Structures are given as C-alpha cells and as structure tokens.
Ligand binder design. Structure first.
Ligand SMILES: Nc1ncnc2c1ncn2[C@@H]1O[C@H](COP(=O)(O)OP(=O)(O)NP(=O)(O)O)[C@@H](O)[C@H]1O
Ligand SMILES: Nc1ncnc2c1ncn2[C@@H]1O[C@H](COP(=O)(O)OP(=O)(O)NP(=O)(O)O)[C@@H](O)[C@H]1O
Ligand SMILES: [Mg+2]
Ligand SMILES: [Mg+2]
Lengths: 89, 511, 430
C-alpha cells in the first residue's frame, strides 16, 4: 500500500515521507522499515505491544538474527521473493 | 453472673433488670473493648456474645434508635426495655479502659514500636516489651492458611527450585513485607515496588503471579483474596490496597481494565480526597507492556520493574503450580514475619551487604535514576536470602544478583531521556528527510523542518525549535527543557537546535 | 458538684435530676464555650468531659433528636431523660458568655489585631492587649512537633547549610507565614507564591519539598500532613488549603494529577461557588514544567517561581534529609512566628531594605510585570534573614539576592509577550 515511500537505491529520497528501503534479494526481499513507522503501523492495526510481535516475528525468521533494532534505526524484514513483480522490483 | 451495675445484670443467659419483678432484656451482649479516633473523636466498640462472635461498631450502636439493629447480627432484644438496655451497655463500656485500634495488614506503625499484622498478629521485641495490653487489629483480608506448608514446599522443590524466574516470583511476594519493614526502619525511603509480569500469552504469568501471593494468602479469584483483576474503578483498586503495608496483591490482565498516573499512584501509598494510604508491592500481568501508552518519564521506569520472560517451562509446570497454590497457601510469610522480628539487625546488615555489592558492581552509573535502583535490587536479593533460610533450601544468590545486573545494563538506555530522545530524532530526520535542505536555504515549498549538513565525523542537523517541540509531544515526552538539557549533557546539542548525529548515517540520508 | 440549676445537677460522676427521688441521666457532659456565626446565625459549642475531651458541635446537638448521638463520641446518656438532659445543657450554655471562634492556620485576622495559629496559638502584642478572652481556634492540621529541634538543626548543618537551593527550600517554607504576615500589614498585596520544583527524576525535589515543610509539621505521607499529592479533584485540593494563611504544603508529582486555570487559583485564595479562602505558599514537584500546557500569559509567570535545578548534591544527601525530617519536624516555624510577633517593625524595615535593594539593582526593567517580581524576591530574602537569626546560623544573603537577580535576568524574555512572540514568528516564517 505504501510502496511509494520505500526507496530502492539505498537512500531515503522520498521528498514527502519515508518509511524505509526495499531491495530484491536472492529468494527473499529485504524490506528495511523505520522503527517508529513500524510501531505506528502496529498500533493502527490494533496490535498493542511491539516487542511481542517483533520476537514472535524473529522466531519464524521474519526479522533476522542480530541485524536490526530488536527486543533485547530500521527493522530488517525478509519477505517472500515472488512478491517482487507487484512490488515493482 | 458475668456483669452487674445498679439494677442491671448480665449472666450467661442474658441481660436483666430488677424492680419492685425481674425481667429479661436481651441475649448475652458483651462489650470487650472501646477505641477513640483522635481527629474524628468518634468512638468504636467490640461487641460480642459467649459463642465467640466478634464485630466492631461505632458507639452510636448503643443509642435506642440503633441498638435493635444488633438483631441483624444475631442477638436477641426485647424492645420494651431498649432504653435501659442502651444505658446498661453504655455503663459497661464506661468501666472499660481506652484501647487503641490499629487497622491494616503488613507492618503496622505503633508509638510503642511496630506490629506485623497477617492473619494472627505478630508483636515485635520493641512492642512486646513496651505495651501493657493485647493489641487489637482489623484483619483486613482472608490470609487464613489452607492445606499444608509441606505441600506448598513440595511443589516448590518440584516445580520452582532451579527456575530463576519462578523463584523471583516467590521472592517478590515476601519482599513486600521485607521492603515495608526496611522503610519502617528508614533504611530505604521507597515503600514498595510495582512488579509487572508481561510477555506473550500462555507463559505462566498469571501462574507465577499466584505463586507469588500464595506466600500469605488465597491466590485464587474469590471473595477476599490476593488474586484480582484490573476490572474496576480507581476508586476500588486503591480501595482494596488501603491499609496494606506488606501483603502482595495481583492485578491480572490489563486488557480487562493512558496509564501514566496510575503507575505512579501504586509506588506511593497515596489515595484520593482522609486518604487511603498503603505501602506494599503489587504484581501486574499483561500481554502488553505498562510503559506502553505511558509518558516517556524516568520516574516511571524507576518505581517499576517489568519482567518480559517466560516463567514456566512447560504447560504442565504451570498447571501443576496453579493447583498446588489453590489448595495450599499462607504458610511462608508468617515465617518471614517471625524471621524479620527475631533477626532484625541481621537482616539490616544483610541488606547493607547487598546494597554495597550492587553499588560496587555498578560504579559506572552516573545517571541518578540508575543509582536509585540499587537499593531496590538489594531488597530483592536480601528477600531471597530470607526465603532461603526460611524454607531451609539452597537458593543461588549469584544468579539473582547477576539477573539484575543484567536487567540494569539492558535498561540503562531507558532511564536516560537523552538516549530515548536522540532515538526518535534520528528516525524523525530519516522519515522526514524530505523537509531538511542541504544548501543552507529552507527551500521546501510545502514545509521546512530544518537544514542538514555532512560534517567531519558528524552530521549537523539544524532543526526548527517548534518542530522539535511538536515531535516530542507526539512521542509522549512531556517537557522540552528536560530533553534538551539531557541531550546537551552527552554532547548531542532563536530558531534551531543544533544536533550532531553519527556520521555513517550519511549514506541513507543522501548526504 | 460542678454545676446546678433547678433540679438538674452536674457532679464529677455525671448529670442528675430530682423530684418529689434522684436519678442519674448522663455521663459528665460540659459546655465550655459557644460561638455565633454572623451571616449564618448558627451557634456552635465546645462539648467536653472531665478527661480533656474536646469537640465542636453545632448547637442543634442539644435537641432531643440529636443529643443521643453524643454516645458516638464516648459519652453516656439515659434516654429515659433526654428531654430534661437537653434542657439542662441548654440552661448551662445560657450562663456562658458569647465567645468568638477564629478558624484556620497561619495568620488569623481579628478585630483586636492578629493571631498566629500553628499547633499552639500565639497572641500578638496588639491582640494580647485589647480583648478579655482566651482565643479559641480550630487547629486545622497536625503540625505537632516530633523529635527534637536539635536533630533537625544537625541535619541542617550537615546536609543543608552551604547549599543554596536546599537553603531556599527552608526559606520558602517559612516564607509562607512571612509573606502572609506582610500582606496582613499591607506591605505587599499578593498573599503568597506558588513554588514549583522541576527538573529530571531523582534530583532531590520531593526531598527539598519535605525539607521545606518540616518547618511547620509532618513532611511525610499520612493522615493530616503537609506532604500531599495532586491525586484528587480540584474540589479537595482547594479544600485542604481552606483557612490556611501561612503553612506551606506540598503537592507531589503532577504526573499523578492544560493547567493555566489551576495555577492562578493557587496564587489567589479563591475557591469555587461560600468559598474556601486561603493565602499561603505551596510547593509543587514534577518531572515536567507547569508552564508546559499553559497559556502564553505574563500574569502566569509572575505569581509562580519555578526552580529547574538539582537540589541535593548526591544520593545520600537526599536520603539523610528525608530521614531527618520524617523523624524531626515542626520546630522552626514556631520560632519564626515568635520572631514576627516580637520584632514586627524590625522585619518590616528589613523588608523595605530588601525591596529598595532589588529596585536599585534592577532599575532598567521597564516591563511592568518584571517590577512586580521585586517585592516577591524581597519577601524571600527577608525570610532568609529571619531564618538566619532564628537558627542562630550564618546564611549568605548575598548569594540568595544574586541567585534571584540571576533568576530575573534569565527569565526576562519570558515576561515579555513580544520576545516570546517574535520567537514563534521567526520559526513560523522559516
Ligand atoms: N510454559 C508454557 N508452555 C506452554 N503452555 C503454557 C506454558 N505456561 C502456561 N501454559 C498454558 O497456558 C495456560 C494458562 O497459563 P497462564 O499462567 O495463565 O499464562 P498466561 O500468560 O497468564 N495466559 P494469558 O493470561 O492469556 O496471558 C496453562 O493452563 C497452559 O495450558
Ligand atoms: N542528587 C542526587 N543524585 C543522585 N541520586 C539522587 C539524588 N537525589 C536523590 N537521588 C535518588 O533519588 C531518590 C529519591 O529522589 P527524590 O528526592 O524523590 O527526587 P525526585 O525528583 O522527587 N525523584 P522523582 O519523583 O522521580 O522526580 C533517593 O533515594 C536517591 O536514590
Ligand atoms: Mg493470565
Ligand atoms: Mg519525587
């Protein structure tokens, strides 16, 4: 929905509002998303604790091991690769 | 003939008066003790029978208007004789001496020392020696022991021992009475800690929570118990805590309740509008943090400790614990009480040893608010040692010390406005980079937040004051000056604040 | 036989009546003094026994409907004789003279002068001379001394003396009575200052706050004390301040409470809807400013002074103070009271000296609202001098003067609508 605010070439060059950085990787898509934005999107979909969701996500290997702002700048999410067409990758 | 005055006489069959005919007035109605409340002036009375019935009334029960209401409480009265009977009972309490009524549970303050009020009342060496009378106390909970110490201890060995967090849970519960005891001795100034068991669903929170309060009384939902929910008004939560200085209580599940003020309220036994006053420790349970929808305030993280770890190892462990405490409770804290009373100096010295250990192991903390946690970690370890002696079982104090040394270091950035704030700021720049210009001029034709410049091993971000204030309000900070001043001290800082950010952000910020 | 009329008699064992037979109808019940409220008309009574029990009732306690309720208050009554017993107690109070009841704490206004109501009651040279009565006062707090002056003073030397802000904190607390005393003398028109201890968490605020009120009474949380919280309605905050014109009170932690309106209310003893009227100084404590969520009004910054500095030097400094004041309190302000009473002219001249000093040191202030702070800084320094005499210790008055000259100069642009406004404007343009 907010693809417009994720830049591809490593720099946050959306002049109106930046949510993160998106990169097509080998059989996964790296979506780096700003923490605050991640918190807000969770409150808005009626999650009520970030950390719980974060570790929950990490256990299935959605967020990865020790790269990102975990539980104890960005969250580093990996998404299934073949979404790449629709995400304009 | 248990009592007589003038024409009125009390025997084991009741009251009677004599005239020129001897008539029965009432069932046995006995006045055992009167009390006088200083500020109000209002007197109170213990009214009994010979079948061990005990009730406390305001003395105006003895007016002819009110006395028949004793029939509600099981007595019998002949209202043809209410006027005398009212007078006879007044005469009876006149003969009584003035007594004093202490109300509450835990450590009760007394001009003749202190009491420990639990289910029975435990007097201290200072008080026992100093008062020439039996103290009288309002029980003020259930707390009556169910089952055996043996069973409780058996589940302790089988389901708790060797498990750090489930051990903490037992410590925490006795640490209410211990903490309160130390405040009473002015060895600490805080009167208790708010503990919050958080984490994901089905992980033993409400279980360890019941385990914690099984120390002094009923850990189940019911009439008058230590296991309760957030489901009520502030009027009644605060109301159930009233006159509590040593009993742990559980508030289970926030979900069934903007919490800032309430957190504070707990740490300090202040009621609303006379006030209800307490000084005890309280365990919360929730699927979401309590610093979630709260101010970004340091004083909040200080009088609160939140454990976000799984307590029980498996589903059976939990189901085994719950069953054990529902059936056996209230056996440990009396032991802790006797221990506090008979080994007072010993505990105070223990506490000193622990405070000194924590001070020494954390001598790198400059932050005032971090030094403030020192005496808090050290009431818990001190409480652990007593748990150890009392149960006569081995408890690894090293692991509990270290657990908190490890809790501290991972909570350092959260007692520091500077660290919390610089964080929203970096993402604010990242997120709203579009509104920060590079070439010195505010040339965003929609909205300008500031100016950004790549400097030598730092990035200069000049940000408009108003914008800086507004973002802080939006992330639930509540004083600019405070945040600014905090940031200025770690060397982070009429138009802009001049922020310096770590250089290697330069790539993503398009510098 | 302490009293008699007709067949009704009061002996040391109680009341009794006689007929053509003598019956006992009540415990010792004594009417010691009556008062009459002008606007209301309603009379009041001091009812006692032989054991120094004292309570104030509206005189309608003596009606046969109400009198039995004295049994709640420990007395004994034979309700076979309530109709008589009511009349005798009426009769007894007819014999009493009219007295006047002054209610409150601090400086109590009297047509025969002024009183200082603390825990005991201190008469002034003007009052002592003119009326033939033992004044009767509603104590209206605890304020009873605990421990020793010596301990409090030892804490003062060991933990306070030489430390500016912790010294102010003691000054501020006694300055309630002094400020009020000066208003009463029309040497100032404001009745008190709202003080706000702000700054970061764990910096001695609630400590300096207890330190401040230990001058007049209990500085700890409890039944009836000077250390309280924001946790209530406006209805009860205002209600606890009622009839207070000289005792400092602490409101601890805003966090457990758009504040514009409440600030004003404090500076002027204005209740809501009769009203509760006060005139005292009050200390707030908070991790965030009170001018945070308030109007951009000058009149707000004027009747409030906010200290955003650390009070205690280290963590032990605080803990020693809290412990010292919890155990020893209420010894200083009585001294200040006696000093005010026996050295009235001296204090007023002192005050003048300070006001003129500040006027001279700040003769560049054109801003009306800044000149208005002059007499405020000067009640505080004046209070410091009295603290100095009273404790018999040296207090550097220069440092307290200059602290406020420096408070002033760094708060100038906040008393200036223009300076705040041009500041919002440049950023609005940017
Ligand atoms: N460690 C565990 N592993 C798996 N299941 C568990 C565990 N602990 C508890 N459960 C299950 O959860 C049930 C209730 O546990 P409980 O102590 O109430 O945890 P809880 O955190 O309070 N649940 P909730 O109130 O929804 O957050 C038990 O009867 C078990 O079926
Ligand atoms: N100057 C200080 N330096 C370091 N720690 C301090 C200092 N003053 C107080 N503390 C710690 O803070 C505790 C109580 O703080 P307190 O005097 O109430 O300040 P405070 O401003 O009221 N804290 P808060 O209510 O959270 O804003 C003491 O027992 C110490 O542990
Ligand atoms: Mg649960
Ligand atoms: Mg405080």
């Amino acid at each position: 929905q907010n693809r417009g605010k994720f830049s591809d070439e490593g720099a946050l060059k959306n002049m109106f509002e930046n949510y993160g950085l998106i990169s097509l990787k080998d059989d996964h898509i790296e979506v780096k998303i700003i923490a605050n934005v991640f918190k807000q999107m969770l409150n808005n979909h009626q999650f009520q604790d970030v950390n719980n969701v974060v570790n929950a996500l990490r256990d299935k290997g959605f967020i990865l091991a020790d790269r990102g702002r975990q539980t104890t700048v960005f969250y580093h999410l990996k998404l299934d690769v073949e979404f790449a067409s629709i995400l304009g990758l | 003939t248990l009592f007589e005055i003038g024409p009125f006489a009390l025997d084991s069959f009741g009251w009677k008066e004599t005239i020129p005919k001897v008539v029965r007035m009432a069932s046995p109605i006995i006045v055992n003790a009167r009390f006088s409340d200083p500020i109000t002036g209002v007197e109170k009375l213990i009214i009994t029978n010979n079948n061990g019935k005990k009730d406390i009334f305001e003395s105006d029960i003895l007016t002819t208007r009110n006395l028949p209401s004793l029939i509600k409480y099981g007595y019998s009265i002949n209202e043809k004789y209410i006027r005398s009977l009212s007078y006879a009972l007044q005469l009876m309490r006149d003969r009584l001496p003035l007594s004093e009524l202490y109300e509450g549970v835990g450590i009760l303050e007394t001009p003749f020392g202190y009491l420990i009020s639990l289910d029975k009342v435990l007097k201290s060496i200072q008080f026992n020696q100093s008062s020439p009378s039996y103290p009288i106390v309002d029980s003020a909970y259930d707390l009556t022991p169910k089952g055996t110490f043996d069973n409780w201890f058996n589940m302790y060995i089988d389901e708790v021992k060797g498990h750090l967090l489930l051990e903490l849970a037992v410590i925490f519960g006795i640490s209410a009475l211990v903490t309160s005891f130390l405040k009473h001795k002015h060895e600490i100034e805080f009167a208790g800690i708010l503990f919050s068991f958080t984490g994901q669903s089905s992980t033993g929170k409400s279980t360890a929570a019941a385990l914690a309060v099984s120390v002094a009384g009923n850990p189940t939902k019911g009439n008058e118990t230590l296991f309760r929910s957030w489901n009520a008004t502030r009027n009644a939560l605060e109301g159930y805590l009233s006159n509590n200085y040593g009993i742990p209580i559980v508030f289970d599940e926030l979900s069934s309740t903007d919490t800032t003020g309430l957190l504070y309220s707990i740490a300090e036994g202040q009621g609303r509008q006379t006030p209800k006053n307490w000084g005890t420790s309280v365990i919360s349970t929730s699927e979401y943090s309590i610093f979630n929808d709260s101010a970004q305030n340091d004083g909040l993280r200080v009088r609160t400790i939140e454990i976000n770890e799984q307590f029980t190892t498996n589903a059976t462990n939990a189901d085994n614990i719950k069953k054990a405490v529902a059936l056996n409770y209230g056996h440990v804290l009396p032991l802790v009480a006797k221990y506090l009373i008979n080994r007072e100096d010993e505990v105070i010295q223990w506490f000193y040893k622990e405070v000194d250990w924590f001070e020494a192991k954390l001598k790198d903390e400059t932050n005032n608010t971090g030094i403030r946690m020192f005496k808090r970690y050290a009431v818990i370890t001190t409480s652990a040692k007593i748990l150890g002696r009392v149960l006569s079982t081995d408890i690894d104090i090293a692991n509990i010390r270290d657990y908190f040394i490890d809790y501290h270091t991972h909570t350092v950035s959260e007692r520091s406005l500077a660290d919390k704030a610089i964080d929203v700021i970096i993402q604010f720049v990242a997120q709203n980079r579009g509104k920060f210009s590079d070439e010195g001029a505010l040339k965003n034709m929609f909205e300008n937040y500031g100016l950004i410049s790549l400097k030598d091993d730092h990035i200069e971000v000049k940000i408009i004051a108003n914008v800086f204030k507004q973002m802080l309000n939006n992330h639930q900070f509540q004083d600019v000056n405070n945040v600014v001043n905090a940031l200025r001290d770690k060397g982070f800082i009429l138009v802009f604040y001049h922020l310096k950010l770590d250089v290697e952000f330069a790539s993503i910020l398009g510098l």
